[PDB]
Amino acid sequence: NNVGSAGAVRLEKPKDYAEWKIEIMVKFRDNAPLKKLDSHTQSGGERAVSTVLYMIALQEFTSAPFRVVDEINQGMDSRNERIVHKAMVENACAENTSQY
Amino acid sequence: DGALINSVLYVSPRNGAHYFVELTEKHLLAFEMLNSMCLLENYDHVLLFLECQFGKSHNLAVIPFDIILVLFTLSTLSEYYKEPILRANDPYNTSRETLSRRALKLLQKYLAILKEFDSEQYNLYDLELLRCQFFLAIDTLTPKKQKWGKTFKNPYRSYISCLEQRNTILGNRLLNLKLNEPGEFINMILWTLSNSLQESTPLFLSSHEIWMPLLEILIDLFSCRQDYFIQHEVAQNVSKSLFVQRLSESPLAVFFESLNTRNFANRFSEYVFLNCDYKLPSDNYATPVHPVYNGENTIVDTYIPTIKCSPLYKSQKSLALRRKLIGSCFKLLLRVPDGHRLITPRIVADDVIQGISRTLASFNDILQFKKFFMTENLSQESYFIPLLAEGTLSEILKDTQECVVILTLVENLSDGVSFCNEVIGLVKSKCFAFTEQCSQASYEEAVLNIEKCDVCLLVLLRYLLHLIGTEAILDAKEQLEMLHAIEKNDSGRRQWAKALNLGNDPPLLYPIVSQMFGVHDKSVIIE
Amino acid sequence: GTCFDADMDFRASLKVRKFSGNLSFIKDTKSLEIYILTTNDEKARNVDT
Amino acid sequence: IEQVDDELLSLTAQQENEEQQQQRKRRRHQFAPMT
Amino acid sequence: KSIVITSNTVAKSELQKSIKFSGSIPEIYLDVVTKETISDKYKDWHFISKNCHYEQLMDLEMKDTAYSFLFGSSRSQGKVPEFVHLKCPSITNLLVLFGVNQEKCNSLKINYEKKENSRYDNLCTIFPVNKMLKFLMYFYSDDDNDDVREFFLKAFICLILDRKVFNAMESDHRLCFKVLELFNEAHFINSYFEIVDKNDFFLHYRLLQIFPHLQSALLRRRFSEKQGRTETIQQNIIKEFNEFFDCKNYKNLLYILTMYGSKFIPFGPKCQVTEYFKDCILDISNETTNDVEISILKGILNLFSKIR
Amino acid sequence: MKGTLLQEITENLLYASAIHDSAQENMALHLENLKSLKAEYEDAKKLL
Amino acid sequence: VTYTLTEFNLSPSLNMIIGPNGSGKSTFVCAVCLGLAGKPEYIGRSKKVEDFIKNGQDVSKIEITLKNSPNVTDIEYIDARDETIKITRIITRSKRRSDYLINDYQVSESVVKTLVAQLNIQLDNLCQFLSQERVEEFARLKSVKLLVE
């Protein structure tokens, strides 16, 4: 929501159980259509922000005391990095959160 | 120097540009026609308009700067991965050549026209206008701040540019816009330097068809822009401290500012020699590289790659491009006043020299080493190549021999006698001679070090001949004694050639110095 | 060819009033857009403006 | 659908007539040099 | 009863059989090549028709890059004989190494009866053009009889006109310009017209793309005043335009691209010749069922008329 | 586009393209029917 | 490296470290990671033990203290009701073995590894720990990998 984009981690379930796949909806860039995450088509900063947020989402459910991220605050366009820092601030606003 | 830097008769300097040249009626009409054709996506007739009057007339048809940017973007639409799009745009290939190839050829031909001002071949106004257009394109191609990983301003009010309403040519974003992103200029440089030596067909095609020629053109244009900036944009007389500040704003300073990283010396040394034969020291982190324009790393089904380049060809071209990058770096550095150092780029000549010497002396393949040190024009690369040669020689002597003899050969290029005396001192010290502490098992690495040493000394000797000629090789007994000491080192190496550790003969540089200035082995065969 | 001739003649026609403009034919919008730059501004506004 | 085939044949015959008409035309300008 | 797919099946099949390439060759490439029927993009003059001898050429290359003199190769002293005669003693052997077969080496001409000026690309790998030109310059040998120089000149002319060589050619024709400056320009044009047909304006346009400064000279060989009787060069150009217009050889008529820009037919709006050409083009042009060359000529003539 | 006589050209072109597409679909249908008739008449030839 | 005596305090909510790469901050983070039953080759990166050791000094020491809860077994000297777990990792040139310390008591790496396992924290798994190679691996990520995780 802070990025001003709509996205959901959907689990598409065809008739075959092994054919079930994961879809990620992308809206951070209007030009980029809704597609699976990939480095070549999308920009580096938006992809990094998306994958960092996906990591953050799978933290409260996990019982790990904390999560470690390296080479993350290195600049992503100074805009996507700013919004991911804002997301990190918002997550840190909640109490009993993992230390990064 | 030349007229390209000191011809400002027709300029009308403005706040944004000092090279600005007003348009005349014929050139205004040509600009309008070219932009009108480019609006209709009729790039074929744009190229035909430029080519049909190239070399057939005294007067010159000047390419507008925005058309130059369009050609830069067109040069990225290589056939091997954009064949369907190019065929769709031009179903009747009347020129029997790709749009990318024609645009690139026009860019290189006009760069060649610009690099020398033939006032007799072309009138001065057209040449100055062409320089202004190229400089405007370069100023529009200013790199963004380096990232680890404003829209369009038209100076001419007489016509509406084609780039005002668009940002893509044939599905490829404009080259300036793509490179005016935080981590794309360094990405492009690393991509082309890595793929210059790839054996993968798509990567090598991406480097060989798109990015090495474009990088050549961009480096040449930035060098010309740097010369013009130093000639005019600075305030001539200066307190030697404001000049450093102005140099920090120079086009090459901004060019290399996107390459500062954390430590410029070592990271730059790795960047220039990326994917070379040298062993990576201190486990440096791998540099991520990605294709610049979507599927550069794929080959479309319709295109069939039917060209093969020998490894020597690829290595030669890659090392020449690397030399051009290093030469631009040194061209920026050598203007820095002594004592002072640049503010924005944290770059020092000694640091870069030492880093390049460390990377060169770590080469395990002699072919790339020689390709780096073999240049077709000695005068062009004269201002940094001897420094790299002497530095690599010093480092090789340091690692091979515990006693590092200080080398003063660069300033000894002024006096041949001093150079020959220093060569005699090094060879008598046995540092240049083949070293006895090296074991039989490690004979191959010692041979590699010696042959690199010989290459460095040969480079310095060619530069000495370039600066003094052949006048007192025998007239001065010092040069004769230098030749006899070369023969002494010949005998020293021949000692182990007869020791028969390996059948391969060790590197002996007596025949080469004989061919250059040894007077064909002195009097061994002459008399 | 026709659009090129029309664009060039429109550019040459606007010079009478000391203007500088161009025609743009778009198939995505199926429309002809006229852009004109007069003496006062520095950006080619839409002709409707 | 036989009507589609009939329309195709009619369009093909129209193209044939048009190409014959094109083939019939010749050059009408003689290029008098004059001035 | 139904055994073939249009006429592509035989053409695609027999392009596939003579393909000289060891790879995939997807059927989409064969389909797009064999279904042109409008333009001759894929049919061109191919001097090199066999795979290059890659190993021997690389041996020549490592011998060339590093050698004793390490200096610019002079036109005299045999052009580093010591290894070039051990590898390829004669220029014909060098051409065989390049990929030219012996039959074409013996007769350096474009056989228009065998349609050698319109052949499908054989997809044969070629060795890089600059090194090939260097190896050919190693066989120049100014100090010899006229026959050897003539053979070298005609071989060079055939090589530069090759479609693969022209496409893989570098932006600057430094070596090509050196070879051209070795010979007299009129001699070069005479040999070129010995090689190609005089009405093959497609290769004329290709040559003027390689060497634009030859344009006027080439015209002085095609519409020569003395050979044109009392008629001027412009009158001969008009007559040739008339004959191509009446014969409906619209492709050869288009390759107009050769004439324009010279002293005889210049760019500009007030020229009479361009107006006559456009008047005839608008006469034939129907825009409904035409050859594409007519519309291409209309556009090109309009553009050249606008160029001042 | 109407005054320059470019609209009629596009109209004719799109009509011809639609006719071509419909004729191609009917051509595929005709191929299917022709193969069915081939099989039926081959059965008739076995009877013969 | 360049830090022979240093102390660090980490915020309960979230932590921020500011400093250029190669200045020891990444070295300090890697040392903290290796302290809790971590090895350089188990974090998806090159193994350089000598880099941690101060040039000249025999032993390099990292100490990390964590809250303790009565839900983890195989602990030395520390009671279940105790709230302190002290884990120390030392690297020395002369000795080549995996010896850790739990509340200043020498143990094999197996004990600290099973403690790390019983704290629901994993080093090999890319979700809990993210490195440059792991960042690159996430950059080009397929839906099958999402299903697998």
UniProtKB/Swiss-Prot annotation, chain A:
Q: Which residues form the signal peptide?
A: none
Q: Known post-translational modifications? A: Sumoylated by MMS21.
Per UniProt, subcellular location reads as:
Nucleus; Chromosome
**What miscellaneous comment appears in this entry?**
Present with 892 molecules/cell in log phase SD medium.
Q: What does this protein do?
A: Acts in a DNA repair pathway for removal of UV-induced DNA damage that is distinct from classical nucleotide excision repair and in repair of ionizing radiation damage. Functions in homologous recombination repair of DNA double strand breaks and in recovery of stalled replication forks.
Domain remark in the UniProt entry: The flexible hinge domain, which separates the large intramolecular coiled coil regions, allows the heterotypic interaction with the corresponding domain of smc6, forming a V-shaped heterodimer.
The text of the family note is:
Belongs to the SMC family. SMC5 subfamily.
Subunit (UniProt): Component of the Smc5-Smc6 complex which consists of KRE29, MMS21, NSE1, NSE3, NSE4, NSE5, SMC5 and SMC6.
What this protein is called in its record is Structural maintenance of chromosomes protein 5
User: Upper lineage ranks?
Assistant: Eukaryota, Fungi, Dikarya, Ascomycota, Saccharomycotina
The shown range, given as first to last of full length, is 945 to 1044 of 1093
UniProtKB/Swiss-Prot annotation, chain B:
Q: Which InterPro entries match?
A: DNA_repair_Nse5/Nse6
User: Which keywords accompany this UniProt record?
Assistant: Chromosome, DNA damage, DNA recombination, DNA repair, Nucleus
Q: One GO MF term, please?
A: ATPase inhibitor activity
Compartments it resides in: Nucleus; Chromosome
Q: Which GO terms describe its biological process?
A: chromatin looping; DNA repair; double-strand break repair via homologous recombination; regulation of telomere maintenance
**Any one of the GO CC terms:** nucleus
Quaternary context: Component of the Smc5-Smc6 complex which consists of KRE29, MMS21, NSE1, NSE3, NSE4, NSE5, SMC5 and SMC6. Interacts with KRE29.
Q: What does the function comment of this entry state?
A: Acts in a DNA repair pathway for removal of UV-induced DNA damage that is distinct from classical nucleotide excision repair and in repair of ionizing radiation damage. Functions in homologous recombination repair of DNA double strand breaks and in recovery of stalled replication forks.
Extra notes?
Answer: Present with 907 molecules/cell in log phase SD medium.
Q: What is this protein called?
A: Non-structural maintenance of chromosome element 5
Which species expresses this protein natively? Saccharomyces cerevisiae (strain ATCC 204508 / S288c) (Baker's yeast)
Curated annotation (Swiss-Prot), chain D:
Location in the cell reads: Nucleus; Chromosome
Query: Where is the motif (Nuclear localization signal)?
Result: 24-28
Lineage, top-rank taxon, reads: Eukaryota
Which residue ranges does UniProt annotate as crossing the membrane?
none
Family assignment from sequence similarity: Belongs to the SMC family. SMC6 subfamily.
What the protein does comes down to: Acts in a DNA repair pathway for removal of UV-induced DNA damage that is distinct from classical nucleotide excision repair and in repair of ionizing radiation damage. Functions in homologous recombination repair of DNA double strand breaks and in recovery of stalled replication forks. Probably plays a role in structure.
Anything else of interest in the record? Present with 339 molecules/cell in log phase SD medium.
Quoted from the entry, the domain comment is:
The flexible hinge domain, which separates the large intramolecular coiled coil regions, allows the heterotypic interaction with the corresponding domain of SMC5, forming a V-shaped heterodimer.
Subunit comment for this entry? Component of the Smc5-Smc6 complex which consists of KRE29, MMS21, NSE1, NSE3, NSE4, NSE5, SMC5 and SMC6.
Q: What is this protein called?
A: Structural maintenance of chromosomes protein 6
- Taxonomic lineage from the root: Eukaryota, Fungi, Dikarya, Ascomycota, Saccharomycotina
Swiss-Prot record, chain E:
GO biological process annotations for this chain's record? chromatin looping; DNA repair; double-strand break repair via homologous recombination; regulation of telomere maintenance
User: What does it do?
Assistant: Acts in a DNA repair pathway for removal of UV-induced DNA damage that is distinct from classical nucleotide excision repair and in repair of ionizing radiation damage. Functions in homologous recombination repair of DNA double strand breaks and in recovery of stalled replication forks.
Location in the cell reads: Nucleus; Cytoplasm
- Where the shown chain sits in the full protein? 156 to 464 of 464
Record's GO cellular component terms: chromosome, telomeric region; cytoplasm; nucleus; Smc5-Smc6 complex
Keywords from the UniProt entry: Cytoplasm, DNA damage, DNA recombination, DNA repair, Nucleus, Phosphoprotein
What's a Gene Ontology MF term here? Answer: ATPase inhibitor activity
Protein name per UniProt: DNA repair protein KRE29
Q: How does it assemble?
A: Component of the Smc5-Smc6 complex which consists of KRE29, MMS21, NSE1, NSE3, NSE4, NSE5, SMC5 and SMC6. Interacts with NSE5.
The gene that this protein is the product of is: KRE29
